[PDB]
Amino acid sequence: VDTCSLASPASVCRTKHLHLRCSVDFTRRTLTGTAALTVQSQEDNLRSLVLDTKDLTIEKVVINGQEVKYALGERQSYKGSPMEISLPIALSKNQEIVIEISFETSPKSSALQWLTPEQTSGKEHPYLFSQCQAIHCRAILPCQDTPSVKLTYTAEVSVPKELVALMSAIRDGETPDPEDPSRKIYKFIQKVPIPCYLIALVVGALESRQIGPRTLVWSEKEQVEKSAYEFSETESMLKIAEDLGGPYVWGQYDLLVLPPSFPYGGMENPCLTFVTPTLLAGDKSLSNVIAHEISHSWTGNLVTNKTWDHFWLNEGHTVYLERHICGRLFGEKFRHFNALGGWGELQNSVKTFGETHPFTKLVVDLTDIDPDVAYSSVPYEKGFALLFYLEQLLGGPEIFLGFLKAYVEKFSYKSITTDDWKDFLYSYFKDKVDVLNQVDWNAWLYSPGLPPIKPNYDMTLTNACIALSQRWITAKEDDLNSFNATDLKDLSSHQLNEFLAQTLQRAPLPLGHIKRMQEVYNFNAINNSEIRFRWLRLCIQSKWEDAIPLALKMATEQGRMKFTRPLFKDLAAFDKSHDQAVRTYQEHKASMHPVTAMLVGKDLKV
Ligand SMILES: Nc1nc(-c2ccc(O)cc2)cs1
Ligand SMILES: Nc1nc(-c2ccc(O)cc2)cs1
Ligand SMILES: [Yb+3]
Ligand SMILES: [Zn+2]
Incomplete structure (x- = not known):
């Protein structure tokens, strides 16, 4: 079962289709309308069903043209409140009904950010966007908010006429709203069944x-x-x-x-x-x-994790494919560069969490854990590391990509667990089970910390990054004069980033070294967000007061958690910026994304 959902499981009933008809009200910061769920019973004599909700106001539930009885349970923290609906007529196995729920969202829906005009580029119009992954769809509409259930959808969204709605679906036309000529209705159709975390809306x-x-x-x-x-x-x-x-x-x-x-x-x-x-x-x-x-x-x-405990299936294989795309475009040495960069990222995460921390496990038990709190680069990079290790073990990229394609084909339109993946791995590579039995599965899948084996990485593109990093780390005061802008002349932006990543791992450096770096490399002028992020972290952790306003600025002027969260942590850990970090957070709190606000607040212990 999915311990993150309070809804009836897929073994009881399945949503086949959602028809969403709603209106976006910027003055109230609410979405209002009806969610019509086509539900199929998986059981004999089914007389009620439970849906996930979070901060939703329910007006009525209609089935076969009549209002039906429903009740909302106690809130269970981040899981929200279960909504039980009493079915008018008992359902047979495989019988389908349509349940139409009239609802309104809360302005504090954790799924949504509402932006004022002053928070936009154009400064004239407001803006709305959604983010349902992992379990925020329930904060937009009543649903079985679990990736084990996949549904198609259609939608009509009414918005002020000067604005545009888009969704995670094929655009299916626009018309004036016949109920209100100050508004437009945009229509949408998603014909491929999807888990509900992939439902998305933007209006602006x-x-x-x-x-x-x-x-x-x-x-x-x-x-x-x-x-x-x-x-x-x-x-x-x-x-x-x-x-x-x-x-x-x-x-x-x-x-x-x-x-x-x-x-x-x-x-x-x-x-x-x-x-x-x-x-x-x-x-x-x-x-x-x-x-x-x-x-x-x-x-x-296409192939979806059945529960969030198996999120590495989603992320590990995606990073694996991503690195192949990049490898095809720019060469195998580059795929290896990125792969080795990812191993370094995993080193960071494990060092930061602690090597016994439950969130460094590849498969995690998310019972009573907010998935937003568990989120990190671990399922990405430990997942990738496993697959790259298997690639090397089993005969190389061409062979392992054959498995990858077959795996996608096999499990398309389905939701699977790590067990299913391992079973198919063993099936596809039955001729290599002897090899597969040398894998320490317990350690890879279920143990915290670094993986028991490090894959083999080409070092070609990474050597120069390491060389320069080491020159700086081993430099004494009388060596600082030897550095100059020519050091970077043969480095790509990717290599500059990795040089900073390598150096950051050994932070702090002496304040004199960091001042010299700015003097000769002018890293302050770089606008690349990844490079700038690592550079500002390097400056803060090395205790350069001059970097404080720049770090505060980057932390607040964008909201990507990858950057914002560690910038705030570093600023809170520097005594000279600590009070500024806390105060700045408190000032920006109200206008931040709701999930980011919560996490930064936790990070700052406020
Ligand atoms: N075997 C070795 N791995 C490395 C390494 C490890 C992680 C990185 O991100 C970059 C380089 C240096 S020497
Ligand atoms: N392998 C690992 N996956 C996770 C994880 C799983 C689900 C989430 O929504 C966020 C993080 C933590 S450690
Ligand atoms: Yb010296
Ligand atoms: Zn991803």
Whole structure:
């Protein structure tokens, strides 16, 4: 069972389809309307069912044109409140009914961020976006909020007429709202069954530009041009992904560039990937995030984790595919560079969590744990590490990609656990079971800390990063004069980032070293978000007071948790900025994304 859902499990009943009809009210910061769920009984004599909700106001439940009895249970913290519905007529196995629930969301829905005009690029219109993963869909509409159930959907969304709605679905037309000529209805259809965490909505002053045969970029007008350039590799990435994963089944692959407060680098919403504007480096250097979101169209969206305990299936295989796309575009040495970078990231996470911490396990027990609190790079990189280790063990990339494609084919449109994956692994590689039995499965899947084996990594592109990092770490005062801008001349932006990543691992450095770095490399001028992030962390942890306003600024002017959370932690750990960190958080709290607010608050112990 899914310990994160309070709804009837899939073994009792299954939602087949959602029809959503709602209106977006910016003045009230509410979504209001009806969720019509087509539900199929999996049991004989079914007389009631339970749905997940969180901070939803229920007006009525209608079945067969009549109002029916329902009750809301006690709130169970982050899980929300179970909604039990008494069915008018007992259902047979496989019998389907339609249950139409009239509801309204709370302004504090953890699924939604409502932005005032002053929080947008254009400063004229408000903006709304959703983020349902893992378990926030219940904060938008009543549903079986579990990835074990996959449904198709249709929607009509009424918005002020000067604004545009988009969803994780194929755009199916727009018309004036016949109930209100100040409004427009946008229509949507998602014909491929999906888990409900992939339901998504944005409403705002959006413009679009075409960047490939099946891709429009959407954003506020101010970001469209930069976005179209930054993500121009999208179609070639899709073509490579199709070669590795099989047919792209989703029709459209559009991109939405969100305002700065979007909490993740991206979110793989079907037909409409959501991305952070911190990707806009000016040189396409952060495009691996697009590769990653594209790869989710197979691993995650087609083959889905059955519960959140098995989230590594989603993330590990997606990083694996992502690195193959990047490897095809830029070479195998680059795939290895990124892979080795990912091992370093895993080192950080384990060091930070503690090597006995339950959240360093590949498969976790999320019973009574808020998945938002458990989220980290561990399922990404430990997942990737396992697959890359298996790749090397089992005969190399070409062979392991054969498994990958077969795995996607096998489990498409289904939800699976680590058991299912392991069973199919053993089935596909039955001719190599002897090899497979040398894998320490208990350690890999269920033990905390670093993996029992480190894969083999090509070092070619990483050597120069390590060389320069070590020069700085081993430098004494009388050596600082030897550094100059020519040191970076043969480094790509990826290599500069990794140089900073390597050096940050040994932080603090002496304040004199860090001042010299700025003097010769002018890292303060770099706008690449990844590089700037690591540089500012390096400065704060090395106790450079001058970096305080820059770190505070980066932490608050964007909201990607990858950056914001460690920036606030570093600022709180520096005695000179500690009070500033806490105060700044308290001042920005109200206008932050609700999940980010909560997590930063936890991090700051406030
Ligand atoms: N065997 C060795 N691995 C490394 C290494 C480990 C992690 C990184 O991110 C980068 C390099 C240095 S020497
Ligand atoms: N392998 C691991 N997966 C997780 C995890 C699982 C589900 C989430 O929503 C967030 C994090 C933590 S450690
Ligand atoms: Yb010396
Ligand atoms: Zn992902």
